[PDB]
Ligand SMILES: CC(=O)N[C@H]1[C@@H](OP(=O)(O)OP(=O)(O)OC[C@H]2O[C@@H](n3ccc(=O)[nH]c3=O)[C@H](O)[C@@H]2O)O[C@H](CO)[C@@H](O)[C@@H]1O[C@H](C)C(=O)N[C@@H](C)C(=O)O
Ligand SMILES: Nc1ncnc2c1ncn2[C@@H]1O[C@H](COP(=O)(O)OP(=O)(O)NP(=O)(O)O)[C@@H](O)[C@H]1O
Ligand SMILES: [Mn+2]
């Protein structure tokens with residue numbers, strides 16, 4: 188094996204239950220490091236880590252860092268966190284989540300997946316292709332890979348597939364061999380001082396982390412990405428529906444919640460793809476995945492097998508089941524989409540699978556900052572469903588911003604006159620409210636990045 192990180196005996200994670208944090212912790216646990224961590228919440232993730240031998244503390248206290256050789260910190264952690272403050276006082280190395288991810292990547296063949304939307308999905312897809320190819324990859328995904336039942340896996344090969352978060356610009360730590368950029372739209376704009384040009388510059392800097400011989404795989408259908416190509420200074424391979432795409436998608440058809448399409452490769456090789464998840468957005472994600480795999484020299488059959496049986500990522504167009512309600516049989520689908528674009532493509536994918544029956548949405552806005560920044564776009568997109576239940580903003584640690592709450596969204600949606608939303612501030616009433624507005628054959632989308640998935644789970648179990 189590769190020698191242990193020098194003098195690193197115990198790695199302490201502040202926010203260890205995190206989607207990215209937990210996977211990093213699990214990789215290192217399985218490499219033989221002592222793992223400790225704290226989290227304000229105990230759930231399936233922390234329980235799994237504890238059962239595997241991680242020392243897990245619920246709630247934060249300065250004593251929890253005892254023994255730590257290094258402290259890894261989620262960007263969710265406040266500056267005045269007692270563990271964080273004490274670590275700095277005691278001069279224990281304190282590093283970002285992504286810096287520890289970078290260390291996992293350092294001596295590996297890193298395939299980093301960046302972009303505004305679809306990172307978790309694309310990472311899961313590449314992970315499954317490489318697994319299918321018998322390449323035994325390590326992966327660290329920012330979400331549950333359904334065919335793994337977990338977010339991360341330690342393989343014995345040198346491959347690492349990893350999701351690369353731009354939200355705090357922390358992906359600049361990463362030194363990959365191949366970098367995917369799925370798309371670029373304004374999100375997390377506070378980090379970039381509301382300046383989209385600073386986000387662009389940051390992604391260019393990220394791509395400049397590639398070695399001179401490294402590969403950037405970028406969506407041809409994104410005009411921002413295409414504008415940036417001259418700045419990359421590394422080989423760029425593109426994918427998408429665009430006539431100019433190196434890996435070009437043609438003849439896309441969605442049947443039910445499966446996609447069918449052809450991909451045309453740079454050497455004019457034609458590959459007929461069956462994708463086990465719906466929507467053109469997922470065809471894009473899967474073509475990023477196919478492009479990476481083809482450029483790596485992976486055979487078609489492995490790519491196609493993995494895509495045809497792709498079970499998805501948790502919470503990403505995730506079918507929870509069918510339920511017989513007093514007013515009809517309904518389908519409950521959970522989706523992580525939290526940016527207007529994501530909500531949009533999800534609605535469209537649902538429409539192309541359902542057809543005659545209604546799309547009912549339970550939407551929980553994530554962040555006041557995001558609601559403020561993209562208010563008008565949310566109003567437009569949320570008006571495209573047939574029935575809309577609005578939940579209160581999931582604060583995600585943010586103080587309320589005036590005019591950027593669910594009541595304000597409801598008022599503005601109501602003004603458009605396409606749908607009349609019902610605000611459900613008391614989620615214990617959600618079941619009763621739904622049952623009143625449910626019709627036979629409804630597809631219910633539980634939509635958002637916050638506690639909406641927990642709420643939909645509790646709703647599904649009660650049903
Ligand atoms: C804050 C941030 O940078 N989070 C990104 C990061 O995930 P990470 O593993 O650091 O944590 P996380 O999944 O956000 O969860 C934070 C964890 O810290 C815990 N927590 C939070 C505050 C605190 O004071 N103490 C504490 O212990 C929470 O209980 C939770 O278990 O890397 C992941 C992979 O790249 C990203 O998916 C993830 O986005 C989160 C999930 C997110 O909510 N993203 C969007 C929707 C957003 O914040 O707007
Ligand atoms: N290529 C895409 N373009 C636009 N929306 C997408 C795309 N792929 C997926 N989505 C939508 O975005 C949601 C989140 O997808 P996901 O793969 O988790 O993106 P992400 O980039 O990992 N998000 P995040 O880590 O929170 O910044 C999905 O549930 C879909 O609603
Ligand atoms: Mn993600």
Ligand SMILES: [Mn+2]
Pocket residue numbers: 303354374375
């Ligand atoms: Mn994001």
